Amino acid sequence: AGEILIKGGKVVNEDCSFFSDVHIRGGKIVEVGPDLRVPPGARVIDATDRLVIPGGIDTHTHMELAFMGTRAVDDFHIGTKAALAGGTTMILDFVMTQKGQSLLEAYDLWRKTADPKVCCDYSLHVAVTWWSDEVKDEMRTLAQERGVNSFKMFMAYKGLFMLRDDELYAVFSHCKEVGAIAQVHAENGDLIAEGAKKMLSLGITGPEGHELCRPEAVEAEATQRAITIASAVNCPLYVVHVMSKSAADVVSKARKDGRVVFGEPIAASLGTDGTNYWHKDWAHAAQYVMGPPLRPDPSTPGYLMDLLANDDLTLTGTDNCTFSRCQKALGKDDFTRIPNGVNGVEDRMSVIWEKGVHSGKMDENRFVAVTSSNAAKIFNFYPQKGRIAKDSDADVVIWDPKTTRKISAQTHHQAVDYNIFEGMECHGVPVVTVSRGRVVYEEGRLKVSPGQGRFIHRQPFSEFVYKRIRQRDEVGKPAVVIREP
Amino acid sequence: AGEILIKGGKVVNEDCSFFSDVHIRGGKIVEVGPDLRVPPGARVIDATDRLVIPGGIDTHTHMELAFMGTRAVDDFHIGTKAALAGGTTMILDFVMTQKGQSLLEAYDLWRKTADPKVCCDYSLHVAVTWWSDEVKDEMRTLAQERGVNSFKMFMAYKGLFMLRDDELYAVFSHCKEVGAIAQVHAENGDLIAEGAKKMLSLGITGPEGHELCRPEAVEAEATQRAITIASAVNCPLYVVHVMSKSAADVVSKARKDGRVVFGEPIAASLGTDGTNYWHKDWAHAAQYVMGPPLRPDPSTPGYLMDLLANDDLTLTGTDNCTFSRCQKALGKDDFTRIPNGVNGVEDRMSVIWEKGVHSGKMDENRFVAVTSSNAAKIFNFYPQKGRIAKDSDADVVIWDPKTTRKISAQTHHQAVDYNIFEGMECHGVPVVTVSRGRVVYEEGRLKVSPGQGRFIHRQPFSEFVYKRIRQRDEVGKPAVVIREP
Amino acid sequence: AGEILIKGGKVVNEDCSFFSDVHIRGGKIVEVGPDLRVPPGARVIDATDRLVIPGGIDTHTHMELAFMGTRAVDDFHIGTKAALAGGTTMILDFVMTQKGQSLLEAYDLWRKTADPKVCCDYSLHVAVTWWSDEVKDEMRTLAQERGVNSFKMFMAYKGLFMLRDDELYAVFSHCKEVGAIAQVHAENGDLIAEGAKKMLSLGITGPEGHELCRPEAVEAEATQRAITIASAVNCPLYVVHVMSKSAADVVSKARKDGRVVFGEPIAASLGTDGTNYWHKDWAHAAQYVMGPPLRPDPSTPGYLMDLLANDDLTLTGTDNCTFSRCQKALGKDDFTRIPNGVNGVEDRMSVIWEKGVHSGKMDENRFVAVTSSNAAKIFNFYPQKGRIAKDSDADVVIWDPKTTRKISAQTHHQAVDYNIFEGMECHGVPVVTVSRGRVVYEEGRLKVSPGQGRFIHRQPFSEFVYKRIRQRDEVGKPAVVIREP
Amino acid sequence: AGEILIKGGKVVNEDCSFFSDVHIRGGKIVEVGPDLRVPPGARVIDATDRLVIPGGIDTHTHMELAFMGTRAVDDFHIGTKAALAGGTTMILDFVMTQKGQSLLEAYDLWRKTADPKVCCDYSLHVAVTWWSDEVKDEMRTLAQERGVNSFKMFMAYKGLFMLRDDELYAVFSHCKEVGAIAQVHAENGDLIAEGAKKMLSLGITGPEGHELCRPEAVEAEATQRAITIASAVNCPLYVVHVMSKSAADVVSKARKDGRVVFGEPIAASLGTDGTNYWHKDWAHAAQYVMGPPLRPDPSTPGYLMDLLANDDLTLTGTDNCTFSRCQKALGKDDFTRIPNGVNGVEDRMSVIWEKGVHSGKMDENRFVAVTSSNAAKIFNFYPQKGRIAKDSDADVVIWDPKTTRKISAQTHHQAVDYNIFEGMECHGVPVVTVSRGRVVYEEGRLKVSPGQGRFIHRQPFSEFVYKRIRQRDEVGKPAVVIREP
Numbered sequence A, B, C, D: 001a002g003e004i005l006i007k008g009g010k011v012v013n014e015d016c017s018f019f020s021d022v023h024i025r026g027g028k029i030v031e032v033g034p035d036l037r038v039p040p041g042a043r044v045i046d047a048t049d050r051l052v053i054p055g056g057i058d059t060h061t062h063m064e065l066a067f068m069g070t071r072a073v074d075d076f077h078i079g080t081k082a083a084l085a086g087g088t089t090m091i092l093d094f095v096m097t098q099k100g101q102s103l104l105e106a107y108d109l110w111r112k113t114a115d116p117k118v119c120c121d122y123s124l125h126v127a128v129t130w131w132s133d134e135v136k137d138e139m140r141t142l143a144q145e146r147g148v149n150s151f152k153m154f155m156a157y158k159g160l161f162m163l164r165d166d167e168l169y170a171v172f173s174h175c176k177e178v179g180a181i182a183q184v185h186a187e188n189g190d191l192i193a194e195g196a197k198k199m200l201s202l203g204i205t206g207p208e209g210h211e212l213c214r215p216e217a218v219e220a221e222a223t224q225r226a227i228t229i230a231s232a233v234n235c236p237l238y239v240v241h242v243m244s245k246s247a248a249d250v251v252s253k254a255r256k257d258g259r260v261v262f263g264e265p266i267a268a269s270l271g272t273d274g275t276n277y278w279h280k281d282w283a284h285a286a287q288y289v290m291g292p293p294l295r296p297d298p299s300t301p302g303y304l305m306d307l308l309a310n311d312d313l314t315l316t317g318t319d320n321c322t323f324s325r326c327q328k329a330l331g332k333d334d335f336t337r338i339p340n341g342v343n344g345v346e347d348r349m350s351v352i353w354e355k356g357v358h359s360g361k362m363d364e365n366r367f368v369a370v371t372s373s374n375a376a377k378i379f380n381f382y383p384q385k386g387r388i389a390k391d392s393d394a395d396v397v398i399w400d401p402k403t404t405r406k407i408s409a410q411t412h413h414q415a416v417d418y419n420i421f422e423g424m425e426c427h428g429v430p431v432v433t434v435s436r437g438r439v440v441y442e443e444g445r446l447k448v449s450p451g452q453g454r455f456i457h458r459q460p461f462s463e464f465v466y467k468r469i470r471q472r473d474e475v476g477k478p479a480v481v482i483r484e485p
């Protein structure tokens, strides 16, 4: 089996923290309590002066994605290893179906690519990048038989992934029918397309042109529009990579107004800012280029962290989609050709601890909710993951909140040859990572094999996402007025 | 010439009020001052205990518009007479060009229809309901040679007038090029189209279905999106008929954030509410049907009036587009077929005085700004109209703020056979209306002939609308960062 | 011992819901799991088609309080019985120390009064109604030795309980020193005092005068001021009975801005409104009189419920402080003499279920958080109460969410002879209440004895309230700038 | 008489701009029109390529005020000269009555000090720093016979000027009775007093301690509280020197909600920020010390300017209260002893033009409203000043908007030996200043004598401030409900 007893630490769940040992047997947590016996043969991890937390769940990755004429350098193998070294024990990666391509074929191609390579557990969202009867059927199959309750739609990427309002209305309606959550990349793709054209014509070909062609208003607008279409059909919505104060405030206002919408800032938008696009060194500026862009208002990451603490924003991913320096160089003369994407899978947990807990913005329990539990609740496997409790999966991180580590591309485990968080000194270090009941990272070294992680099959109609939707279907039906003809 | 001396009243301009007489000769105000001599032959209007104000300018009319299978019943003749009887001395009506139709032909057809019928002065906005090189040229001709500096675009009316984001971007860009303001009907036409389809399928065929298929979120969304596209191209924007709290707050927030946008609530949204669509009497409910709909939150008209007082909203029109009871009946089985449009041209001034000044929300001077002066400033003929001052046009109303009048279809001068403000007791009565230097309304009787009013030709680049736009063009150009290759 | 097995229900905690039976032995939940064995002698409660939830914790009561010249009619005995019949298993009542009176004496007097009468568990907050060295010491004693980590201060009740800003600053500073939370009744007592004087002078002596003398601005102002003083000293704050949209928005904004403040709406402000004060029947209007008053904007209770769902507001109490019809009549000629206080202890759970869960505003799990768990977290006994889990106290309610019950003073168990929620039909009925491991309410009948409940002694420095405060003390210290003299 | 013809410029009023010459005779503008004749003997000022604007009116000065143990160095003579050189032709200075001192004596002492020294026109506000029957009477005398319709109250300066809520309620009530506007210095004086005590105890004795002891929350709170008390008594309110985003947003929200409140940012808060208090050079940091402090958020002055453009904030003063370097040094060991006050009288017009008009935030006409016209409207002498029009006072500035000037203490005309705007390059230069019909500043040289300016006596009940107040008194009276006993 492999038995492990994590002894002497303080367990930290989303609700409260308490001292207790944790007994792991066979992939599962089988007991949580004080002073547990060490069974003969079991390995003891000494978690004295440490916190024992559910492993991080990164809701947003693109490992080895073919995009913008090249392929991301962190692949399923290296990317999941880097996750583990950074205290993340699950990733959820996007099946990026091409326009006119079968969603089932694209799903199968992702499972074939990832199944033999992942080092930690994972699951998949599926992008719906076009619409038709076939797509409709395949979404039902994916939700009922293939383990997927999240579909990803794009309002940006005109010509490539974009859907118009009438198509989003149909797609969101069908999400609600199959019990799936609708995820959206919310930027106005017409404004992006025109904006870029204008920045190029004015000779602004560098990364500053990338931010200036699609400033935060462009993200805030599409975010409000997605919310409005989703509310019209009573479909739950998930806005991925919220990058700006104004888009975050759209989400904040919609939630206060009782709309079923969740917002996901990412490690990049919580840990750094878009002033980097104006850096004199082209390579440096290019490293940060992603859609939607990081924003040049320096108060952004702190504000996003305050809203993450207060649950205006609810959980975190990384949008890990990495391109090395020579790949980013594809766009040296033309920002539109810089492959979009930044790093974060490995450093998300330390960045959020330093910028959110050490700073006093959120407590350790809210940290667990926004790095693991809420993802498990929304994507429908809580408390199987996201909670240190008997019968839960043994994906556990032993965490030192007092020690710092400096993030550097010289010491990171990602494939990419630079790091958007270079030089950041973070409190909060993953000292030991356990995945599926096995020690896969300890004493700064990984011990794991490609294919050791498993795909997690979820069911639709996640209760955290749907119980309000369903009650509103039952009491919120519009009524005719009764009238003489 | 016709000489008139208005004696003993208190003149009320947008800036301040003061006692003085007003001498009118030849269509113009030629002196303003205390104790003026009555020249032999001049008529004295005794304005003791009255206010002397610029005549109302209704920014938003559709006299005799062919629409939804019939033609509005208030035409240029009757509609302008009704305006005069209600203290409004100018209307600005929309040339509703059809898809694929020449803007110049449609403009000519409106001038031929209106020139021999109007009883008061008027001008025209031109709708841009499709896009092409021809449309581009014709907009330049209209702005430079035909007197028109306002173009009207629709985000609603899918299949009929609607433009997509990329077309709005081009159209707004060209507005800015020709020095015109971009007006928008801001509702999401895809959501309207789907929403109506859904209300019909559920058997909600009455007017309540019309409001429910396009609730205020649908107006607020498109309003934010228009603002965002206009801000992207630095084009000034004018949101016509703001009908809801949430859309008004979008405009309010954009202005505070320094966007060049103006919002226009109408008499309907300031004077009544959408609870009427739920009335047991179908005919009654149908009377209120227009796009965007009046809203069922009863706090709406008061809130819109508070924002009009505070200049979150800046000026007022009526969207006068009237259909008698037997025309509204076209939609007795299907709300989508009810011709959209309500009354207001005649009652706008009294409604706004009662709901805004008598209530203590705004003072008499702000009343003048939101009923005449701001319209003259935005559409580019201030202080020719909108101000009691020497050399200004003699379009003047003698106003009794203490007496009430009850609005009723039994006593109104509009062609329509009902009135959305039926029974409202309003303080503030137009006792005498002067248009082009002639008494056209007094002792409750009109004295005016069809064709007596003139088309007002405006120039582009109105300073109130463009001086900030032009300065931002000069200091707000994006700059490249200077970098080694 | 008394053993109980609650079988066949769905357990509902703040985090998730799941089918399982619950085994109670000796006052405690000793097992939670599927298909549990019934031990010989144990009573089975059949919870098929029911939810099994932690009993409600009412954070805010005033049982038998001597106030405004009389004494509340629901006393510790009747009041706790009524709580039980309504699915509430703990109350937290205010020790209302008089000006210049020893806090220790007042605490002792409350424990002597309540200990032999309560039918359910309870604890106490202590009011700090004056300040001095003695009060300082006694607060430390109360926090460290008497079980109390909450102190209540008043900005209203000039002459009676009010404290000025400089006294609030000192009191809040000392709360933070002893690890207590500062609770505040937030209305401007100078404006109340003047306002009432003015309403009386104008002959408005009825209950409408009570609301009009202290409209919502008066509550919103003091709420912002308390937040600002508490933030200045880094003391955690708890705003009790939030009664208005504007005060709730103050709390909402402060939380988004990362201030450690919690807001507590009560059953009255979630279930009805202040239009009642304008009722033609004086007695009826008087029934609703409390400070701060219910508000005449009908959108209030729904808005408060939306903010409770979204965690702008965090938990609920009742401010139960009841006066029968003949006691309310003390103020028949003068609203200032109407004893302030309404009912709610019994009906809070059904009111919140009907207005919050059945309406689709919050789900069953958020219902548990805002009726029990958050109170246990803030006042420092979670998960001892507020959670169905092994080792937790057996205070458990078997809840039917589908059946309705009509609230009426004819059928309620409170001592008061009317009910502010008279006639309300609520979904969600407590079918069986278990307190301390005993069935105390079932088949509509109570089975409990005075003194059967126990006082719950808490420790200071509740982690849910203090872990951010303490981290901010460690990294948020102001620093001198280093300068040459 | 002295006759002047200002020829060839563009006149800029609050409403619009137009080319015309301006004929000045005898202290007054006697004609405005194109191509005016030069009468023999008249001086022509050639205003080709210049704007002709009403002279600036600085609503907020403290010339030669004895304060904090010394006396401001810019006195009535030097201060008014410096005003003139900077295109400001009127100041309104505060009679700072001491606690227990007669308001009439203090007023007389100011008139005796200023009358023989001012070089431009001026008027006075009177501080009400204590309350009693005498103060009540003297306020009536001041409003009806001494020319003063503005009274200044302080919520800060505990022990020195502070008034409590109940005193503010009485004072504001009596302001409304005498037709005066209530001005407030809005910071919580208890929090200031405690905060300073705490910063000193922690060894933070430098200017950073001054900002940190009273951060923007402290200003925002008192600002909301003043608004709430003023709204309770229907008294018009004027918040002087709005220094922070959060206080400005309080004012913004109150106006949108229809409260009669005006907000006045000053040149300091529009032109620089509080990061200066952290400067390594003590003297430099001390230069900026005033109450309320400048704020360390760098986005502050731009935000205040956006709200000034949008009329959330309405007009501008300087709070000119200058102390030279050796006077500021009184507090070298203890920030509480640094005499509070900064410069601005001379540079206000250029700072606001550069930061507001050249930047594209407001147009030239809004510049006139926020630098002259609105002050004349609120303090009750419009259009006597604040407007280029026939019969108005000839206080006129010939303004070059295209040329820049660098502000420096080396070239300024103020008595103070440094300048908070040192080094700022501003577009917009006053080339010629005319005061009372005389050229007092031209070719960089002043030509004016002490005592040449006059005190301007105003009447109470300014219409811009009172017409809404009075209508609300007439329709907004609370009504009793009619009930059987």
Ligand SMILES: C[C@@H](CNC(N)=O)C(=O)O
Binding pocket: A062, A067, A185, A289, A290, A291, A292, A319, A321, A340, A341, A342
């Ligand atoms: C495909 C993808 C990758 N990169 C990026 N967005 O910048 C995403 O849009 O989220």
Ligand SMILES: C[C@@H](CNC(N)=O)C(=O)O
Binding pocket: B062, B067, B185, B289, B290, B291, B292, B319, B321, B340, B341, B342
């Ligand atoms: C055409 C027109 C007419 N009617 C209406 N909108 O309801 C308008 O949309 O403004």
Ligand SMILES: C[C@@H](CNC(N)=O)C(=O)O
Binding pocket: C062, C067, C185, C289, C290, C291, C292, C319, C321, C340, C341, C342
């Ligand atoms: C004493 C008490 C009772 N009644 C009331 N407030 O109306 C409270 O203020 O909360």
Ligand SMILES: C[C@@H](CNC(N)=O)C(=O)O
Binding pocket: D062, D067, D185, D289, D290, D291, D292, D319, D321, D340, D341, D342
């Ligand atoms: C007295 C005066 C002077 N200085 C200052 N406030 O910093 C004022 O408070 O406005």
Ligand SMILES: [Zn+2]
Binding pocket: A185, A240, A241, A291, A292
């Ligand atoms: Zn994306």
Ligand SMILES: [Zn+2]
Binding pocket: A060, A062, A319
């Ligand atoms: Zn992505």
Ligand SMILES: [Zn+2]
Binding pocket: B185, B240, B241, B291, B292
């Ligand atoms: Zn329209």
Ligand SMILES: [Zn+2]
Binding pocket: B060, B062, B319
């Ligand atoms: Zn229209």
Ligand SMILES: [Zn+2]
Binding pocket: C185, C240, C241, C291, C292
């Ligand atoms: Zn209270």
Ligand SMILES: [Zn+2]
Binding pocket: C060, C062, C319
């Ligand atoms: Zn209470």
Ligand SMILES: [Zn+2]
Binding pocket: D185, D240, D241, D291, D292
């Ligand atoms: Zn001050």
Ligand SMILES: [Zn+2]
Binding pocket: D060, D062, D319
């Ligand atoms: Zn001052």
